[PDB]
Design a protein around this ligand. Structure first.
Ligand SMILES: [K+]
Ligand SMILES: [Mg+2]
Ligand SMILES: [Mg+2]
Ligand SMILES: [Mg+2]
Lengths: 102, 51, 85, 55, 74, 354, 21, 120, 95
RNA sequence: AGCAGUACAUGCUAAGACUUCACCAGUCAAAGCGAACUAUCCAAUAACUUGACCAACGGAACAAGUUACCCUAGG
RNA sequence: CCGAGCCUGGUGAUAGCUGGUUGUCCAAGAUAGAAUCUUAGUUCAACUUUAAAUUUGCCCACAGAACCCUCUAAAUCCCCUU
């Protein structure tokens, strides 16, 4: 009676757009640059590139009542940190090619 | 150790790659052996006798 | 027996029925004859363009094979090779 | 026999005939909705018509 | 003919739809406002509490609803 | 197995013994202000700045411009403080501010801005647009001399160039009117370069205009080392950067090596690199002023190619990489029927041998 | 991750005084 | 066609922009910045500048915030910046200072909304 | 499965397979999803859409279906205006 | 846990992925269009659809006791 | 040996589970899982044979994978070089 959830793509792995980076019951890894979130908190790549995991300062949305209450009660000088997953775009959006010589 | 991890890096790359090419070349050269007429006609000698 | 999994519902049974093949035996079929094939047949002298070309001449020149028992209703001329016809 | 919610079929008022089942509270009047209607490609009034099942 | 009848039936009903949607939205707001009054109606009963601590059923509170019905009647 | 941190861990100075006595943020804004500050700081652990932040030489950018002007801070602070006390003294000023009817003269602000922070804001804009990266290979200068370039559009109108604003090639058909503050006796060089226009070499530029040995503000009297040529951004090639550079010469300079014929309609002869041109004359002239505008193709460009340049107009398109698909498999289990269309090249029916 | 030096970089409940519901 | 940095859905503010307007209000001054998503500051207007400060009775009031918007809008057009995103908090958006500053930007030609990316 | 019919001594086709599967001439088998018509009210739009897809069978299933049908069901057919005509032949398949 | 709240674009379509795993089933989703712009068969139905506490829950369409008179089976 | 006679035929009846299964040589070759009126059996899995096509496989540097209090160590995943 067990299921498989966790990191599908580890650090430095190459992902294509739409690849599921990780599956989680709760937010253990947060969406970074070019990483989308699903309804079930699934993390997926929005661009083709290399997966990177970093530690970034956490700032919740002002309307996230539950999270805003936490940060307001923190001692001044203390910053919350979380683990974020990013995708570093490997290719350019496009190139300019000569098509005609009018 | 005679070399550090950084200096060892890539020193054997060329040989390691060429060795795999030999493995690849052997694995793609499989084909049925040639068939020769002399082999088939030679079987007629089973009935070879002194005149 | 083949198709028995030892107790569970077989895969070929648990899939729902859908009319993929419904009425297949009554569907009309047409053998495709391309302009490439028609031109090739004319080039090799197997179909003569100087006379009316019908199913008999196409069949006689071995250009097409018609199976009436397999619901073939004739030949359907297809545009493949139109550029060089 | 009794359920908190009822499954009922909403029919479009446009007369196209598109209908979708919807959930409403048992103790409520006939439901009317502005659900989207594919046939007309725009939102249209939907009128509750027939009870399908009880949840 | 069947296609045309369905096409004409849809067109006729669609013509009446904009007015029907407007009328429907009005009855929604009407009931939306009645709901707002329902909240304040219970508040009015509390106004007649006269420092009554108990949250149990109050005869005056129920009677005032009947009295309000009497006020409406004319 | 645990590894000691490779440096000070976050939220470690915070004394947990007296948590209740510590001062809390109490507000989202205060936490956010501290959060942004912490993010900017460098950290031993992996951060977004590492992978996405641009990698640039740590050594400070060389400054090749004119020296900063000398200012007496004590006198400057004295006059400014007295000016504000005079302004605040007026009852009408206080009433206008309280009633929210007061406003600032935009024209007067820009006049003072040009004298004070404008050179440093133009440098920031030039840095953001990559002019220093592409013109001087990362060397930077502060445009101390405000350069005013305007294109006469029609008879009574003028299209100004303000460091990045868009000017169409039609408006730039003729040489612009250039003015700047120059003391008597000074000599200046003015060039116009297209950073993104070159059709053959990625790193090269086109010399659209080059005036040398300009005496003071009299641009017309300066020698025409290269006749003016309108910007011709190719259709579909995007937005191009056109940068006017003003150089303050230290003495008369011989530009015969950089001379070009009149008229010059050969793109090979107008191929230009500002870094190489400045490098040979760095001893004698210093970058003084900078203006630039953004240009994209317009109908007037076609005339330049066919008539002035006597060539066919090149057209470009923005082409994206072909969509990625996994390697097709013989049995695409659980994939929709349309899976086979992803690997299909022709939409028309095929008949094989038949 | 536990083994890595950055283990615990995102712990915050110690910073907040525990409250019993 | 340039890709915006999508993601960061669980944190504030969003990174999905090319340029954004950021307003920094201090105890004594008002500052408005236009910066690229990569963190570079394209143009800026601040009450600390003498050019603006000398025409202001106060540098911390609504009039100062409106004046910064009018000045920044002019500098934006000169720099070729016509579109940007503004990411305020609920209280900042409601405040009259930001309403006046936003109005000055829109009346100055800045749209305060960026065009969508063209994926295809 | 009948390998040798009582009257003809010939292999027989499993008609259960014909009812549920479509065989493309390339050897692929197409089927419907189980329960695509059942209890739609309690299924999300995304689940309903994948339930109405025509999906391919895996290698193991395809070989089993091939054994259960005789050669007649594997012949090439030229039906007029067949919706699956293009899918009968594979394209750009290296393997 | 075998539910409820509360919305009614839980619209259409479509790259790329995940999955208790084997299958069946299940899950996430860019772009785009349009909006907003904040189990199987069986049985009923015109259609769209609905229905077995099939709880032994991969479910035979539908069936209990007893044998110390016992019969057969191997371990 | 009649808790229901015997004989022939249906009949080489069915099930269940044992037992047996006949020359030589060479090559490869031992896995330990899921569903089921299913656990003395089976079919998809695990391992295994032959042929074929092609290109990496194994070992494994750093970096990297969560908070919630981790018994927290012994380890794992990922992984260039070799
Ligand atoms: K170029
Ligand atoms: Mg979308
Ligand atoms: Mg052996
Ligand atoms: Mg490896």
């Amino acid at each position: 009676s067990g299921r498989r959830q966790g990191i599908k793509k580890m650090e430095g792995h190459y992902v294509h757009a739409g690849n599921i980076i990780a599956t989680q019951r709760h937010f253990r890894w947060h969406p970074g640059a070019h990483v989308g979130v699903g309804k079930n908190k699934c993390l997926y790549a929005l661009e083709e590139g290399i997966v990177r995991y970093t530690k970034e300062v956490y700032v919740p949305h002002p309307r996230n009542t539950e999270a805003v209450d936490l940060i307001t009660r923190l001692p001044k000088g203390a910053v919350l940190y979380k683990t974020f997953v990013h995708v570093v775009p490997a290719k350019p959006e496009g190139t300019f090619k000569l098509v005609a010589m009018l | 150790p005679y070399m550090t991890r950084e200096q060892e890096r890539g020193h054997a790359a060329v040989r390691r790659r060429e060795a795999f090419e030999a493995i690849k070349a052997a694995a793609t050269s499989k084909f049925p052996p040639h068939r020769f007429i002399a082999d088939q006609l030679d079987h007629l000698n089973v009935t070879k006798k002194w005149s | 027996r083949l198709g028995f999994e030892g107790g569970q519902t077989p895969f070929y049974i648990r899939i729902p029925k859908y009319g993929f093949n419904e009425g297949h035996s009554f569907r009309r079929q047409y053998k495709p004859l391309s302009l490439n094939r028609l031109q090739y047949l004319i080039d090799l002298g197997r179909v003569d363009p100087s006379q009316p070309i019908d199913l008999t001449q196409l069949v006689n020149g071995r250009g097409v094979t018609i199976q009436p028992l397999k619901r073939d209703y004739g030949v359907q001329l297809v545009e493949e090779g139109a550029d060089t016809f | 026999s009794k359920s908190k919610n009822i499954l009922v079929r909403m029919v479009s008022e446009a007369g196209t005939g598109f209908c979708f089942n919807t959930k409403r509270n048992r103790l409520r009047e006939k439901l009317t909705l502005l659900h989207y209607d594919p046939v007309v490609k725009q939102r249209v009034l939907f009128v509750e018509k027939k009870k399908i099942r009880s949840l | 003919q069947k296609r045309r009848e369905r096409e004409q039936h849809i067109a006729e009903c669609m013509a009446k739809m904009p007015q029907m949607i407007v009328n429907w939205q009005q009855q929604q707001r009407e009931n939306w406002e009645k709901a707002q009054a329902d909240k304040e109606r219970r508040a009015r009963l509390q106004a007649e509490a006269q420092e009554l601590l108990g949250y149990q059923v109050d005869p005056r509170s129920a009677r005032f609803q009947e009295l309000l019905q009497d006020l409406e009647k004319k | 197995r645990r590894t000691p941190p490779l440096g000070p861990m976050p939220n470690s100075d915070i004394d947990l013994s007296n948590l209740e006595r510590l001062e809390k943020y109490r507000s989202f804004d205060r936490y956010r202000r501290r959060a942004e500050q912490e993010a900017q700081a460098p950290h031993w652990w992996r951060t977004y700045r590492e992978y996405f932040g641009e990698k640039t030489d740590p050594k400070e950018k060389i400054d090749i411009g004119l020296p900063p002007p000398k200012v007496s801070r004590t006198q400057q602070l004295l006059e400014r403080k007295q000016a504000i006390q005079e302004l605040r003294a007026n009852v009408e000023e206080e009433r206008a501010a309280r009633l929210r009817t007061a406003s600032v003269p935009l024209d007067a602000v820009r006049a003072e801005w040009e004298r004070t922070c404008g050179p440093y804001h133009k440098q920031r804009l030039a840095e953001y647009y990559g002019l220093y990266r592409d013109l001087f290979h990362g060397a930077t200068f502060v445009p101390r001399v405000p350069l005013h370039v305007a294109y006469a559009v029609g008879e009574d109108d003028l299209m100004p160039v303000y460091c990045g604003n868009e000017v169409t090639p039609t408006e730039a058909a003729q040489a612009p009117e250039v003015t700047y503050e120059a003391e008597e006796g000074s000599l200046w060089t003015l060039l116009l370069t297209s950073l993104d226009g070159h059709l053959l070499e990625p790193d090269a530029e086109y010399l659209h205009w080059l005036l040398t040995n300009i005496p003071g503000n009299r641009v017309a009297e300066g020698q025409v080392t290269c006749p003016y040529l309108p910007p011709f951004p190719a259709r579909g090639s995007g937005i191009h950067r056109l940068a006017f550079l003003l150089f303050k010469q230290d003495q008369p300079i011989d530009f015969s090596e950089d001379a070009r014929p009149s008229p010059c309609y050969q793109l090979a002869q107008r191929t230009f690199r500002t870094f190489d041109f400045y490098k040979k004359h760095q001893e004698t002239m210093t970058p003084a002023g900078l203006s630039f505008f953004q240009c994209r193709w317009d109908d007037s460009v076609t005339y330049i190619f066919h008539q002035l340049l006597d060539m066919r107009e090149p057209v470009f398109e923005f082409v994206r990489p072909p969509p990625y698909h996994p390697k097709q498999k013989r049995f695409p289990h659980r994939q929709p029927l349309r899976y086979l269309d992803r690997y299909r090249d022709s939409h028309e029916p095929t008949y094989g041998i038949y | 991750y536990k083994t890595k030096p950055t283990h615990g970089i995102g712990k915050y409940k110690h910073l907040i005084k525990a409250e019993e519901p | 066609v340039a890709r915006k940095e999508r993601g960061w859905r669980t944190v504030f503010p969003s990174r999905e922009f090319w340029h954004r307007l950021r307003v920094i209000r201090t105890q004594h001054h008002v500052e408005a910045l236009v910066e690229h998503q990569n963190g570079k500051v394209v143009v800026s207007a601040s009450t600390r500048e003498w050019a603006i400060k000398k025409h202001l009775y106060s540098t911390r009031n609504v009039v100062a915030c409106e004046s910064i918007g009018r000045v920044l809008a002019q500098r934006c057009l000169e720099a070729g910046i016509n579109f940007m995103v503004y990411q305020p908090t609920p209280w900042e958006a409601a405040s009259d200072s930001m309403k006046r500053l936003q109005s000055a930007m829109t009346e100055g030609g800045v749209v305060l909304r960026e065009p969508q990316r063209i994926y295809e | 499965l009948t390998y040798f019919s009582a009257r003809k001594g010939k292999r027989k086709t499993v008609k259960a397979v014909i009812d549920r599967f479509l065989r493309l001439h390339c050897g692929l088998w197409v089927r419907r999803k189980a329960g695509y018509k059942k209890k739609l009210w309690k299924k999300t739009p995304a689940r309903k859409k994948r339930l109405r897809e025509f999906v391919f069978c895996n290698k193991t299933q395809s070989k089993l279906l091939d054994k259960m049908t005789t050669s007649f069901w594997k012949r090439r057919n030229w039906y007029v205006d067949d919706p699956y005509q293009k899918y009968h032949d594979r394209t750009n398949l290296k393997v």
